[PDB]
Amino acid sequence: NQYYGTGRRKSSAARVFIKPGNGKIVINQRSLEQYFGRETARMVVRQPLELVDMVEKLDLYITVKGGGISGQAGAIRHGITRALMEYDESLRSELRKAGFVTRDARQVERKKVGLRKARRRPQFSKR
Amino acid sequence: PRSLKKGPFIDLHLLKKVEKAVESGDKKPLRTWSRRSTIFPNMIGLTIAVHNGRQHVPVFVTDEMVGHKLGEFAPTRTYRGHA
Amino acid sequence: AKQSMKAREVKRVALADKYFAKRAELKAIISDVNAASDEDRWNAVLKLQTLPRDSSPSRQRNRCRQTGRPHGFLRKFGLSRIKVREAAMRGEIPGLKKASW
Amino acid sequence: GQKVHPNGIRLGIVKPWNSTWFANTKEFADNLDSDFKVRQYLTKELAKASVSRIVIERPAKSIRVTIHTARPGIVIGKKGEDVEKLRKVVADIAGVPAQINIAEVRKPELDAKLVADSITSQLERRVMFRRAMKRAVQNAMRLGAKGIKVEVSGRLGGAEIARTEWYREGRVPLHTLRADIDYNTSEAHTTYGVIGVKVWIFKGEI
Amino acid sequence: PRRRVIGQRKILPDPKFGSELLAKFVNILMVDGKKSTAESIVYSALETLAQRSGKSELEAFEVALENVRPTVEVKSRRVGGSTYQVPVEVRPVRRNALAMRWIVEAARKRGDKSMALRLANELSDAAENKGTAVKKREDVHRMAEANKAFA
Amino acid sequence: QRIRIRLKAFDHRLIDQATAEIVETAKRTGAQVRGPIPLPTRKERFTVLISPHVNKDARDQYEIRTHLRLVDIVEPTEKTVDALMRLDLAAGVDVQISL
RNA sequence: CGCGAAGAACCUUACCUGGUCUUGACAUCCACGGAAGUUUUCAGAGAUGAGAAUGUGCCUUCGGGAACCGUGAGACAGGUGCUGCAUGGCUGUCGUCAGCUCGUGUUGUGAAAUGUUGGGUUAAGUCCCGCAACGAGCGCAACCCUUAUCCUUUGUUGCCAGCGGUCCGGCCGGGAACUCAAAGGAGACUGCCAGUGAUAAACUGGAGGAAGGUGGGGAUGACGUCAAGUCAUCAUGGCCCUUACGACCAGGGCUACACACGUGCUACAAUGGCGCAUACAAAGAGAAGCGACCUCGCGAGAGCAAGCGGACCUCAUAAAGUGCGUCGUAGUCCGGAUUGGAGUCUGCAACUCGACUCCAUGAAGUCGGAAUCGCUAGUAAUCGUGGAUCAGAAUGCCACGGUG
RNA sequence: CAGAAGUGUGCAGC
Ligand SMILES: [K+]
Ligand SMILES: [K+]
Ligand SMILES: [K+]
Ligand SMILES: [K+]
Ligand SMILES: [K+]
Ligand SMILES: [Mg+2]
Ligand SMILES: [Mg+2]
Ligand SMILES: [Mg+2]
Ligand SMILES: [Mg+2]
Ligand SMILES: [Mg+2]
Ligand SMILES: [Mg+2]
Ligand SMILES: [Mg+2]
Ligand SMILES: [Mg+2]
Ligand SMILES: [Mg+2]
Ligand SMILES: [Mg+2]
Ligand SMILES: [Mg+2]
Ligand SMILES: [Mg+2]
Ligand SMILES: [Mg+2]
Ligand SMILES: [Mg+2]
Ligand SMILES: [Mg+2]
Ligand SMILES: [Mg+2]
Ligand SMILES: [Mg+2]
Ligand SMILES: [Mg+2]
Ligand SMILES: [Mg+2]
Secondary structure (H helix, E strand, O other): OOEEEEEEEEEEEEHHHHHHHHEEEEEEEEEHHOOOOOHHHHOOOOOOHHHHOOOOEEEEEEEEOOOHHHHHHHHHHHHHHHHHHHOOOHHHHHHHHHOOOOOOHHHOOOOOOOEEEEEEEEOOOOO | OOOOOOOOOOOHHHHEEEEEEHHOOOOOEEOOOOOEEEEEEEHOEEEEEOOOOEEEEEOOOHHOOOOOOHHHHOOOOOOOOOO | HHHHHHHHHHHHHHHHHHHHHHHHHHHHHHHHHOOOOOOHHHHHHHOOOOOHHHHHHHHHOOOOOOOOOOOOOOOOOOHHHHHHHHHHOOOOOOOOEEEOO | OOOOOOOOOEEEEOOOOOOEEOOOOHHHHHHHHHHHHHHHHHHHHOOOEEEEEEEEEOOOOOOEEEEEEEHHHHOOHHHHHHHHHHHHHHHHHHHOOEEEEEEEEEOOHHHHHHHOOOOHHHHHOOOHHHHHHHHHHHHHHOOOOOOEEEEEEOOHHHOOOOOEEEEEEEEEOOOOOOOOEEEEEEEEEEEEEEEEEEEEEEEEOO | OOOOOOOOOOOOOOOOOHHHHHHHHHHOOOOOOOOHHHHHHHHHHHHHHHHHHHOOHHHHHHHHOOOOOOOOEEEEEOOEEEEEEEEEEEHHHHHHHHHHHHHHHHHHOOOOOOOHHHHHHHHHHHOOOOHHHHHHHHHHHHHHHHHHHHH | OOOEEEEOOOHHHHHHHHHHHHHHHHHHOOOOOEEEEOOEEEEEEEOOOOEOOOOOOEEEEEEEEEEEEEEEEEEEHHHHHHHHHOOOOHHHHHHHHOO
């Protein structure tokens, strides 16, 4: 049966199902290499399975929604790490050291009245 | 410019006067405030005293003027150098 | 606002309902018409200019209901930014309260 | 500097709204306008009947108005003959059929609106403002407020230059959102002009 | 800051060569957050430098950076009525930061037909102990030794 | 056929007790009910300058939250639809019904 | 100094020229005659004048009364006229700085002092010891909203793990798993463990956890200073006008142009321009509305017309990006001001003075003197999207998400 | 090590 993890990052959310199998990865019915064109995403999606050293022993089915490229990549990494901790809880102490278990909370800071941006203040002049 | 679907614009209260002025032969200059009215061909050879905000300015309708608005010939602001 | 401005505005609002709300056909059906003869369209164009000018809805200012202020009007409430806040903090508006996020 | 209006910041936390009805944007403004008209009328009408508060509710395409007053018998009228006039004129103003309810404010000395109006009336009676303020504070405290403060502003005593004068007793924690701070304002139209009276009454937290 | 001291933010190593130093270099060459553009430029420059040098990419980059990292810098020190330039032993992390900044800003102002090629040329010159990044390092050392009297 | 009720209010507790009354009276009347669904809370934001003059940067920001609830009567027998027509609610609730 | 103004073609409008009225455009009272009103003409720029053609609510306890209209006399209306240095209310600022005070006691002839100072500590008059002080109040902190983790409940208009069907479309039967919607609850407390410290308060490091020391952000602004801002939002004392500083109307102006300054937008290019293909958002609005599909047009748009008071329909194919080609350091295939020509749309009406589309034209500008400004992390930078005001009319303002 | 000047005149808080 499927082992499950929800993960999320910025506005992106991902559902990850993992199962024993020959290393297949599918995201939104697309190959990893087809869905992501940027090497950073292709690396971060592997990072946890690389460190666990199971890339050739597990396969996973993923769907991901919301946010852009890196948001979804991080959301997938987070879901993968949760699901594989459900698969083998003994790995948690390792993943804690890897830093993946922390749900990255850096949301976008809302604009504030009187400021052009989150913090960019208008140009000031003495006179 | 006005949508080509609608055709050019003239004020009725001006047209009623253009009519009798053409019948009379522009016997006297036709005062008007309809600066927005278009110059129609029937107006050629008339003199219209178009309001400018404080005076009526005589415009003599030359054939070249057709299709312009009357107000284009009555400047509204006075400038003559700063010094 | 000067009381005359209030009388003038309500006069315009009333007058607009006596004509264009009914005779809008004259423009929307005829002066805008393509399927019909240009002579009728021309006659309608000329006729529309005979309606009292203040009957056009485009001439309504849309003032604040409680003080007649023209600027800073809010269409949800019918009030200026001033009177809306005065009523708001006194709790006269049935669901409005200060936001935070 | 300036302070937030202490009622509005507490709306929904501890203070309820004085109007309660749901409306779509189409009729919202007309409801708000007719509510304003009825409030203005009732305030002008009952000016001596110590009306503390007016709550307007619009159920079932009807209006019902609850009036909180420290002098109910004057508002009701003998045999209720007066509420008939109020409800009929309110039905005229709102157009929808009207119902009126009246509620006693048992202790007007603990009501910021009635205290503010009392001080205002006394000022227009040419009472010394110090005495009016002191009397108000002392009565509120002896009747069991957890605290009070009062303020009066502008051309006090006909002075040529305006002042603000304020007096405080007990505890009055305006930054505490749990605090049920009652608050109100009134204005005295003396021969010298407008004197502004503000009243805060603290009745305990939560 | 005057109250705090800050712990360093977590960096991610370069995905192709595994180097945090190359990651910092990319982050310095990056403009407007166009990370992937900078990555492409850096990879092209490194591969062309590699084939020029007969070296691995990181090896050529390291030997270039060795030639430009400064050993000392000049710092303004206040005295009760004067200010003196005084040489200070710059620490290694700031050495790397300075060397990368100097390489990047030197390349940026070259005339060559593309940023990747400008960069490759500047790294070659640096490895060859020549050019603008090296003269920058040099004159920094000159100034330090000229101020050595106050150290 | 089903009947479907949408409740709107400016108070989630008032809307809550309204839905509770609906569900309890309906099931007491033998209705089959598919339970109250919370639809997304449409909210309006306003910004106003609070000075009578100038001071463009001095502003207050306000919101109105409209709470929604959906409930479906999936077997509306005559007595159930009658009872649901008989209920009255506080004016803070708008009830809109469909068949 | 993109400030009131969250939006000046008419209106707005308060200004100018001219034309008009005088108990008045807006209110109450009083007397007289009439329902109100509708359809229509001739004058005039229009205001306003004239004149025709049409029309009777409710008791009438019949005298009229209820609306509205006109007329007529006075009280009176009206004033965006002056005083913000006569005021209320509201707002800016020092400043979200950590301060500011009072009761009783005590000290001093007294103004006053102590407390509130001292040793540590904190974001903090935060906390602990000491001390003629002992207590308290307004401030700090907390309560409030939002965000980062989990759990219960409900499960359509939202979802699709696992099952049958499939036209390959969650689209079908179906499931309530998952995302999500949103009501309720849990969690963070220096709570736990070493070390330092004055057997103190608290500091350093560690465990666990989604989060660690105010976890991030917002709201919240003490006593008071600046005779700070507003009599033009409004209210108001005093003063001034009352055939005019009041009222109606058309046209014009607020959009001028020798110049000087502030805040922004677009650029000077290759970390780029152009062309073709193709990925990944959030948050809002919609009935005098948002407007699909389809047909027509190079385009702005036009015709027809579905749906939606909306987790359903429309606004609406996000752009940066990724792949491929081309340009070759050029005042250029950079830049797109200016100006001619032809059009669309809103509107009684785009001359003064709107927006946008097409064709053509193709300035200055090659990183900016003295000087000066913002920002400490999902920040700066950079790229798109929405909304209010609004018939039409953002490079401004208020919000959202992507890369970072 | 250098760094000068700031017109006259008023009114509440008893
Ligand atoms: K003031
Ligand atoms: K004392
Ligand atoms: K005044
Ligand atoms: K601009
Ligand atoms: K618009
Ligand atoms: Mg400034
Ligand atoms: Mg308008
Ligand atoms: Mg600004
Ligand atoms: Mg004008
Ligand atoms: Mg002034
Ligand atoms: Mg002190
Ligand atoms: Mg101390
Ligand atoms: Mg304290
Ligand atoms: Mg002490
Ligand atoms: Mg606080
Ligand atoms: Mg002043
Ligand atoms: Mg003025
Ligand atoms: Mg005018
Ligand atoms: Mg202007
Ligand atoms: Mg060049
Ligand atoms: Mg900071
Ligand atoms: Mg952003
Ligand atoms: Mg001198
Ligand atoms: Mg002096």
